[PDB]
Amino acid sequence: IIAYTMSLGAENSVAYSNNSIAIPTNFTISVTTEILPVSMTKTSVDCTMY
Amino acid sequence: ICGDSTECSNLLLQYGSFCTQLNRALTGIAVEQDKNTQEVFAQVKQIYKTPPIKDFGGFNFSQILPDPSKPSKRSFIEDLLFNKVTFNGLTVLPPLLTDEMIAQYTSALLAGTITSGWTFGAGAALQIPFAMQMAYRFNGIGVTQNVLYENQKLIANQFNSAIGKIQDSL
Amino acid sequence: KRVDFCGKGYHLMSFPQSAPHGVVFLHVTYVPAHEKNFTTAPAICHDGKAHFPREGVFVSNGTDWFVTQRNFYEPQIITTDNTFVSGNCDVVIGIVNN
Amino acid sequence: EAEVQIDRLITGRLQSLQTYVTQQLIRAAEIRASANLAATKMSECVLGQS
Numbered sequence: 479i480i481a482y483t484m485s486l487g488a489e490n491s492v493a494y495s496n497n498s499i500a501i502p503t504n505f506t507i508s509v510t511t512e513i514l515p516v517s518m519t520k521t522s523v524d525c526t527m528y
Numbered sequence: 529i530c531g532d533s534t535e536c537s538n539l540l541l542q543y544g545s546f547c548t549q550l551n552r553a554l555t556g557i558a559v560e561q562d563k564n565t566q567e568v569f570a571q572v573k574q575i576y577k578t579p580p581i582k583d584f585g586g587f588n589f590s591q592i593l594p595d596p597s598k599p600s601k602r603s604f605i606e607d608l609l610f611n612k613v614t615f616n617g618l619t620v621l622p623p624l625l626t627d628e629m630i631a632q633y634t635s636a637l638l639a640g641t642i643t644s645g646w647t648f649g650a651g652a653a654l655q656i657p658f659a660m661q662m663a664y665r666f667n668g669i670g671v672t673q674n675v676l677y678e679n680q681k682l683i684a685n686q687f688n689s690a691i692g693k694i695q696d697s698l
Numbered sequence: 699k700r701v702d703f704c705g706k707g708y709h710l711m712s713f714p715q716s717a718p719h720g721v722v723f724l725h726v727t728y729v730p731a732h733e734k735n736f737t738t739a740p741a742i743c744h745d746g747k748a749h750f751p752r753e754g755v756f757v758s759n760g761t762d763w764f765v766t767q768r769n770f771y772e773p774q775i776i777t778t779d780n781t782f783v784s785g786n787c788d789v790v791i792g793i794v795n796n
Numbered sequence: 797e798a799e800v801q802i803d804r805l806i807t808g809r810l811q812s813l814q815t816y817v818t819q820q821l822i823r824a825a826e827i828r829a830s831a832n833l834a835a836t837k838m839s840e841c842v843l844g845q846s
């Protein structure tokens with residue numbers, strides 16, 4: 479077991495210039511999933527029984 | 529409740545579990561706070577850095593970019609904001625993310641939005657000169673880029689004056 | 699159209715799926731890749747007039763200059779049909795001459 | 797009767813603790829709503845034009 483300092487991620491220096499751009503030439507299609515709860519179990523309680 | 533008394537502890541024992549759920553709720557709250565900060569701030573896969581040379585068509589971001597001189601690596605406005613705002617069985621737990629990491633996230637976000645426009649939010653950041661990003665953004669609201677390219681200096685001066693005024697007002 | 703509301707990338711469509719106590723969304727998104735470097739100019743001075751693209755951006759592979767759409771590399775020759783004129787080439791900062 | 801007195805103290809302190817916990821829960825729900833709004837605003841207005 480090792481304890482360390484967490485890393486926020488990698489680091490890159492984007493090549494900025496006042497007369498240069500970057501344009502994509504290809505593409506991909508991605509399918510992602512997300513999950514959302516919408517309901518919970520319906521419960522009932524009786525006093526005199528409890 | 530008891531403050532290190534054996535008889536008090538014994539008497540409290542016969543109340544069942546009135547204390548497991550209290551601590552459970554508090555721990556849930558703390559985890560929720562950590563998740564809140566993480567999801568509001570951590571939204572970039574990489575940490576971008578601004579180029580050493582800064583010629584953004586006349587716009588001046590020096591008041592907002594991080595200052596390497598200070599140990600905290602915070603901008604002028606962040607320092608102003610930080611300066612302006614001010615045991616009996618209870619403890620306070622430190623947040624998971626320290627202030628330096630939050631400042632680093634903000635710096636990365638702001639460098640990415642200056643350099644690559646909105647492209648870095650979908651795929652890989654693509655560089656583009658800032659004036660062209662302004663032209664695209666004017667084209668967004670129904671004004672042709674003609675207007676921007678013909679009034680660059682006035683727009684830059686208005687932006688700089690607005691940022692100075694907001695600095696002074698804050 | 700609101701960014702990042704459903705899926706990371708440019709949204710295309712979504713499909714719902716039932717879950718025991720919730721719902722599952724499958725989002726289909728478009729992600730560009732294989733970028734390339736190019737040289738850029740904001741407008742073109744021709745015959746003393748300034749030309750701006752109707753929709754796209756000017757690029758060049760070293761020479762000859764082309765107009766492309768902003769999300770997919772597809773160069774085309776520059777023509778008066780896909781450009782419009784505004785004034786003269788005297789106030790724009792970055793005019794190139796072609 | 798020390799047990800009686802301690803019982804009164806115990807129930808009072810327990811009630812106070814319960815009140816504090818409930819107030820904390822309400823405030824936490826409100827803060828979570830605010831944080832969700834902040835996340836949506838930052839995703840929609842910083843990473844793109846709205």
Ligand SMILES: *[C@@H]1O[C@H](CO)[C@@H](O[C@@H]2O[C@H](CO)[C@@H](O)[C@H](O)[C@H]2NC(C)=O)[C@H](O)[C@H]1NC(C)=O
Binds near residue numbers: 734
């Ligand atoms: C585009 O041009 C740059 C400039 O030569 C290429 O080089 C990169 O420059 C940046 C900024 O200095 C560095 O951070 C990268 O490490 C450089 N890449 C190298 C050395 O391979 C860049 O590769 C070109 N292509 C892209 C897609 O940016």
Ligand SMILES: *[C@@H]1O[C@H](CO)[C@@H](O[C@@H]2O[C@H](CO)[C@@H](O)[C@H](O)[C@H]2NC(C)=O)[C@H](O)[C@H]1NC(C)=O
Binds near residue numbers: 503504505732
């Ligand atoms: C865009 O990317 C796709 C996917 O990588 C490329 O399609 C592949 O092309 C190679 C070369 O012909 C084939 O061997 C693979 O079988 C292809 N993949 C599939 C899934 O069909 C495509 O060539 C790329 N296009 C460009 C212009 O770079």
Ligand SMILES: *[C@@H]1O[C@H](CO)[C@@H](O[C@@H]2O[C@H](CO)[C@@H](O)[C@H](O)[C@H]2NC(C)=O)[C@H](O)[C@H]1NC(C)=O
Binds near residue numbers: 589591
């Ligand atoms: C951006 O604005 C800042 C204002 O803070 C400018 O910094 C000032 O520059 C003047 C002129 O050199 C100095 O007299 C001030 O002392 C500077 N103020 C501070 C706080 O350093 C900065 O020069 C502007 N950026 C550019 C590129 O001009």
Ligand SMILES: *[C@@H]1O[C@H](CO)[C@@H](O[C@@H]2O[C@H](CO)[C@@H](O)[C@H](O)[C@H]2NC(C)=O)[C@H](O)[C@H]1NC(C)=O
Binds near residue numbers: 759760761
């Ligand atoms: C930039 O792209 C253009 C468009 O293809 C190139 O022009 C043609 O290049 C091919 C291949 O070299 C030649 O066979 C044609 O004769 C060229 N057309 C003309 C009108 O000259 C151009 O060579 C490319 N430039 C660079 C530096 O890659």
Ligand SMILES: *[C@@H]1O[C@H](CO)[C@@H](O[C@@H]2O[C@H](CO)[C@@H](O)[C@H](O)[C@H]2NC(C)=O)[C@H](O)[C@H]1NC(C)=O
Binds near residue numbers: 496497791792
């Ligand atoms: C974009 O940046 C370049 C830096 O490479 C600027 O080019 C300089 O322009 C001035 C004014 O003509 C010259 O005195 C310098 O010698 C140029 N620098 C170099 C390295 O050649 C350019 O002015 C900037 N603006 C544009 C292209 O619109």
Ligand SMILES: *[C@@H]1O[C@H](CO)[C@@H](O[C@@H]2O[C@H](CO)[C@@H](O)[C@H](O)[C@H]2NC(C)=O)[C@H](O)[C@H]1NC(C)=O
Binds near residue numbers: 743793794795
């Ligand atoms: C576009 O063409 C014009 C016309 O040839 C160039 O303007 C000339 O610039 C030189 C250098 O200042 C002057 O001596 C000429 O009198 C100009 N001719 C004119 C105004 O008709 C212009 O330089 C070219 N574009 C670029 C970016 O160089």
